Amino acid sequence: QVQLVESGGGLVQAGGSLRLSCAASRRSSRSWAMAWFRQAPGKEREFVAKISGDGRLTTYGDSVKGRFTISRDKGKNTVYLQMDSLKPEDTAVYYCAADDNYVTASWRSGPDYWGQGTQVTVSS
Numbered sequence: 001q002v003q004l005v006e007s008g009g010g011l012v013q014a015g016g017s018l019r020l021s022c023a024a025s026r027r028s029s030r031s032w033a034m035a036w037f038r039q040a041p042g043k044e045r046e047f048v049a050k051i052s053g054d055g056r057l058t059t060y061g062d063s064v065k066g067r068f069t070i071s072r073d074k075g076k077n078t079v080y081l082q083m084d085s086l087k088p089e090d091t092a093v094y095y096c097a098a099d100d101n102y103v104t105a106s107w108r109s110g111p112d113y114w115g116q117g118t119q120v121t122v123s124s
């Protein structure tokens with residue numbers, strides 16, 4: 001069925017920016033909260049940011065608040081993660097995910113659909 005696909009990943013110098021995008025193979029008439037998570041070796045996948053189905057509410061993980069911005073565009077059926085002031089510590093595979101519930105979209109188990117990930121590496 002529905003496939004989420006991340007793009008915009010890369011290898012950039014610290015202090016640089018990237019903008020990730022998550023596109024889907026189909027549109028839904030329903031409300032889906034969307035989220036980004038990241039995973040590095042030696043770690044559990046961790047929540048980074050989420051946005052409610054209507055775009056009005058956003059939450060960020062404590063390590064990225066103020067530096068990253070999540071936003072979504074209905075006409076293009078795409079969700080974005082603007083990542084500024086990148087640090088070495090942000091290096092990870094980033095995944096996008098869709099959840100029918102905004103509260104649980106930050107839980108590892110909450111989302112109903114996940115992409116396969118895009119790699120982001122930040123060199124010092």
Ligand SMILES: CN(Cc1cnc2nc(N)nc(N)c2n1)c1ccc(C(=O)N[C@@H](CCC(=O)O)C(=O)O)cc1
Nearest residue numbers: 002022023024026027028029032072073077078079098
């Ligand atoms: C989660 N998702 C993808 C989805 C939804 N909203 C988004 N919104 C934005 N802004 N960006 C996205 N990448 C995005 N992706 C879905 C989930 C279900 C169906 C789906 O079940 N569609 C049925 C119809 C039932 C329906 O409309 O839900 C179909 O036949 O296409 C489609 C996309």
Ligand code: NA
Nearest residue numbers: 055072073074
């Ligand atoms: Na929008």
Ligand code: NA
Nearest residue numbers: 099100101110
């Ligand atoms: Na859910």
